[PDB]
Design an enzyme around this catalytic site. Sequence first.
Site, mmCIF file in Angstrom:
data_model
loop_
_atom_site.group_PDB
_atom_site.id
_atom_site.type_symbol
_atom_site.label_atom_id
_atom_site.label_comp_id
_atom_site.label_asym_id
_atom_site.label_seq_id
_atom_site.Cartn_x
_atom_site.Cartn_y
_atom_site.Cartn_z
ATOM 1 C CB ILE A 16 -0.731 -0.290 1.605
ATOM 2 C CG1 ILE A 16 -1.974 -1.510 0.963
ATOM 3 C CG2 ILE A 16 -1.812 1.384 1.289
ATOM 4 C CD1 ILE A 16 -2.937 -1.058 2.244
ATOM 5 C CB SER A 18 7.669 2.553 0.661
ATOM 6 O OG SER A 18 8.991 2.784 0.992
ATOM 7 N N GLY A 19 7.834 4.122 3.425
ATOM 8 C CA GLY A 19 8.082 4.487 4.630
ATOM 9 C C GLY A 19 9.885 4.949 4.982
ATOM 10 N N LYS A 23 6.865 0.270 6.080
ATOM 11 C CA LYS A 23 6.335 -0.460 4.852
ATOM 12 C C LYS A 23 4.435 -1.114 5.463
ATOM 13 C CB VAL A 24 1.248 -0.240 4.462
ATOM 14 C CG1 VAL A 24 0.461 -0.253 5.312
ATOM 15 C CG2 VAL A 24 1.536 1.608 5.974
ATOM 16 C CG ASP A 132 2.867 17.957 10.275
ATOM 17 O OD1 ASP A 132 2.763 18.651 9.344
ATOM 18 O OD2 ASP A 132 3.063 16.825 9.665
HETATM 19 C C1 LIG Z 1 -5.344 -1.150 -1.016
HETATM 20 O O1 LIG Z 1 -6.399 0.293 0.054
HETATM 21 C C2 LIG Z 1 -5.010 1.871 0.316
HETATM 22 C C3 LIG Z 1 -4.751 2.624 -0.608
HETATM 23 C C4 LIG Z 1 -4.095 3.532 -0.938
HETATM 24 O O2 LIG Z 1 -3.891 3.744 -2.024
HETATM 25 C C5 LIG Z 1 -2.917 4.154 -2.313
HETATM 26 C C6 LIG Z 1 -1.945 5.090 -3.292
HETATM 27 C C7 LIG Z 1 -0.768 4.908 -3.805
HETATM 28 N N1 LIG Z 1 -0.619 3.902 -4.581
HETATM 29 C C8 LIG Z 1 1.374 3.930 -4.594
HETATM 30 C C9 LIG Z 1 -0.820 2.839 -4.151
HETATM 31 C C10 LIG Z 1 -2.097 3.237 -3.075
HETATM 32 C C11 LIG Z 1 -3.172 4.011 0.003
HETATM 33 C C12 LIG Z 1 -4.511 3.679 1.409
HETATM 34 C C13 LIG Z 1 -4.832 1.814 1.677
HETATM 35 N N2 LIG Z 1 -5.633 2.062 2.474
HETATM 36 C C14 LIG Z 1 -4.605 1.711 3.879
HETATM 37 N N3 LIG Z 1 -5.633 0.556 4.637
HETATM 38 C C15 LIG Z 1 -4.730 1.408 5.653
HETATM 39 C C16 LIG Z 1 -3.529 1.633 6.282
HETATM 40 C C17 LIG Z 1 -2.958 2.551 5.145
HETATM 41 N N4 LIG Z 1 -3.480 2.564 3.844
HETATM 42 N N5 LIG Z 1 -1.799 3.073 5.531
HETATM 43 C C18 LIG Z 1 -0.927 4.341 4.774
HETATM 44 C C19 LIG Z 1 -1.526 5.029 4.376
HETATM 45 C C20 LIG Z 1 -1.071 5.694 2.874
HETATM 46 C C21 LIG Z 1 -0.088 4.363 2.795
HETATM 47 C C22 LIG Z 1 -0.290 2.988 3.784
HETATM 48 C C23 LIG Z 1 -1.517 3.008 6.933
HETATM 49 O O3 LIG Z 1 -1.062 2.805 7.455
HETATM 50 N N6 LIG Z 1 -2.580 1.854 7.524
HETATM 51 C C24 LIG Z 1 -2.901 1.762 8.560
#
Ligand SMILES: COc1cc(OC2CCN(C)CC2)ccc1Nc1ncc2c(n1)n(C1CCCC1)c(=O)n2C
Length: 254
Positions: A16, A18-19, A23-24, A132
């Site tokens: 999903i 990156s940091g 890594k998510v 922030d």
């Molecule tokens: C797959 O579902 C998603 C897609 C998404 O869009 C992304 C935009 C960037 N591209 C490269 C991939 C899809 C953003 C969040 C999610 N869902 C989600 N669900 C749960 C999340 C979470 N993100 N994140 C971060 C937020 C941004 C990147 C990860 C979290 O930290 N949690 C706990």
Amino acid sequence: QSMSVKGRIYSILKQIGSGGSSKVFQVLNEKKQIYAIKYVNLEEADNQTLDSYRNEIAYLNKLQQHSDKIIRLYDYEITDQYIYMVMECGNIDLNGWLKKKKSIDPWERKSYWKNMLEAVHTIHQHGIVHSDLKPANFLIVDGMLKLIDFGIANSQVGTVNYMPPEAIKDISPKSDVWSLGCILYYMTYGKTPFQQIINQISKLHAIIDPNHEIEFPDIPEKDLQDVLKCCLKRDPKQRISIPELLAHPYVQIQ
Ligand SMILES: COc1cc(OC2CCN(C)CC2)ccc1Nc1ncc2c(n1)n(C1CCCC1)c(=O)n2C
């Protein structure tokens, strides 16, 4: 691709986000349920960074029961090497959603605003000021906006467009009001109040300069216009509070 969090097996589907050390991933459990796993590498984290991470986890684990506008944390595995967090999976972040959508629905906007006030209100009640706030901090989980983090742990990195004037001088729950106001202004007028200013030093100067009047174009929703005017007050003492925003006609009318 696979991983284990407290004996329970998860199958990795996609990454999903990156940091730096983070890594998510979008995963699936043994019962074919969809979750989000946040992986943190502690192999470079100092004791101050480790404690900021332990603090954020504890708070997220605590405010879990207090509001459904706070991202679910189902389980976690913490070792010296790593942190694995089994969390609820969202559809997209607010930032990604707002970057995509050309026009935003007024009913959707009210719903989203309401959800942001409840999430931020809950963190304030426990003495936490995010300090922030950006749309990347908010996640859409079934028409519902959820707060991802509390700003405790060390995704719109280095953005000054949502920064309060008090933060530039250097911070109270009123700091989050300025940032939330900027998010609502973006959902109202299509840009942040200072998006027109490219030069960052000039942009920072504009936020702290009262002689630089923030534009508030005429819109059918007068309630909405007043919220933005009330939130975007440069003096925190002159700025509206979260409990007051929850009683504002924009949130409660109809
Ligand atoms: C797959 O579902 C998603 C897609 C998404 O869009 C992304 C935009 C960037 N591209 C490269 C991939 C899809 C953003 C969040 C999610 N869902 C989600 N669900 C749960 C999340 C979470 N993100 N994140 C971060 C937020 C941004 C990147 C990860 C979290 O930290 N949690 C706990």
